[PDB]
Design an enzyme around this catalytic site. Structure first.
Site, PDB file in Angstrom:
ATOM      1  N   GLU A  82       0.809  -1.210   0.000  1.00  0.00           N
ATOM      2  CA  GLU A  82       0.000   0.000   0.000  1.00  0.00           C
ATOM      3  C   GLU A  82       0.840   1.257   0.000  1.00  0.00           C
ATOM      4  O   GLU A  82       1.765   1.314   0.816  1.00  0.00           O
ATOM      5  CB  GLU A  82      -0.815   0.143   1.283  1.00  0.00           C
ATOM      6  CG  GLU A  82      -1.982  -0.741   1.233  1.00  0.00           C
ATOM      7  CD  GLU A  82      -2.862  -0.535   2.477  1.00  0.00           C
ATOM      8  OE1 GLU A  82      -2.560   0.389   3.261  1.00  0.00           O
ATOM      9  OE2 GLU A  82      -3.783  -1.414   2.636  1.00  0.00           O
TER      10      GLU A  82
ATOM     11  N   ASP B  42      -5.663   8.617   9.402  1.00  0.00           N
ATOM     12  CA  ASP B  42      -4.443   7.958   9.672  1.00  0.00           C
ATOM     13  C   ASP B  42      -4.030   8.296  11.116  1.00  0.00           C
ATOM     14  O   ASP B  42      -4.348   9.361  11.695  1.00  0.00           O
ATOM     15  CB  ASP B  42      -3.423   8.406   8.653  1.00  0.00           C
ATOM     16  CG  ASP B  42      -3.648   7.771   7.300  1.00  0.00           C
ATOM     17  OD1 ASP B  42      -3.489   6.511   7.168  1.00  0.00           O
ATOM     18  OD2 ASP B  42      -3.964   8.402   6.266  1.00  0.00           O
TER      19      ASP B  42
END
Length: 261
Positions: free
Chosen positions: A49, A60
């Site tokens: 990723e 995040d």
């Protein structure tokens, strides 16, 4: 390289859990990101990723948010990430899944990510209003749109997600899941199993877990893939230099590859 869905299916038929490193493109610079991608591949990464930095990566964790900020200060853009992939993808044996927030892609056609050798796409803040239009466009470009689900999404919608997702179902949380005596919280075992119960798709688990005994336990609780993000971005982008970052990234990744095997 193969689609993400095929790569995942094959691991699951073999009883194997995929090693899925996550790094942010441009931290500390794109030439170093290229070399990181090749090293990760050589350490046996099944899927990688790759994050496109944006100005508000609110889903995040803080390690990754700080990496994203560093990548925006290195002047990194969607276009410069695609140009690098276009050179590097033919050398990688494993597929790349691009992660981007929706506003930077809201204006793209996805033709140029396909051309650059990207296989999958993850849009963490994808609007409910736009999710089908983007799925259709991704389909039309031969890209798999990998969807998040979280412990906040009710069961019936989680099932709709699993049905729409391609490549794998990505189970994440914005909430930390390890405790102060350094154990994985036991509710995580149920969280993975609630999603496995409704789908035959590969469920990959991105909960922020970095220790080899802990990663082994997430696998043993039935994850088909483990995304290792924060700890990889730390090794690479909190080091003294790009060279030391890469040496630290390779050692770490070998250890995670070993743990998961």
């Amino acid at each position: 390289s193969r689609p993400v869905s095929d790569t995942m299916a094959a691991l699951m038929a073999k009883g194997k859990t995929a090693f899925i490193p996550y790094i942010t493109a441009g931290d500390p610079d794109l030439a170093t990101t290229a070399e990181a991608l090749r090293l990760l591949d050589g350490c046996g990464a099944d899927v990688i990723e790759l994050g496109v930095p944006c100005s508000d990566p609110y889903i995040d964790g803080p390690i990754i948010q700080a990496s994203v900020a560093r990548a925006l200060a290195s002047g990194t853009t969607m276009d410069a990430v695609l140009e690098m992939l276009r050179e590097v993808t033919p050398e990688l044996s494993c597929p790349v899944v691009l992660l981007s927030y929706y506003k930077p892609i809201m204006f793209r056609s996805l033709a140029k990510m396909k051309e650059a050798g990207v296989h999958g796409l993850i849009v963490p803040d994808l609007p409910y209003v736009a999710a089908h239009s983007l799925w259709s466009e991704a389909k039309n470009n031969n890209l798999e749109l990998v969807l998040l689900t979280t412990p906040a999404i009710p069961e019936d919608r989680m099932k709709e997600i699993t049905k729409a997702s391609e490549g794998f179902v990505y189970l994440v949380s914005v909430n930390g899941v390890t405790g102060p005596r350094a154990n994985v919280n036991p509710r995580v075992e149920s969280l993975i199993q609630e999603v496995k119960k409704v789908t035959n798709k590969p469920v990959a688990v991105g909960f922020g877990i970095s220790k080899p005994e802990h990663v082994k336990q997430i696998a043993q609780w039935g994850a088909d893939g483990v995304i290792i993000g924060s700890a990889m971005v730390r090794q690479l982008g909190e080091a003294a230099s790009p060279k030391q970052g890469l040496r630290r990234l390779e050692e770490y990744a070998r250890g995670m590859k070993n743990a998961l095997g």
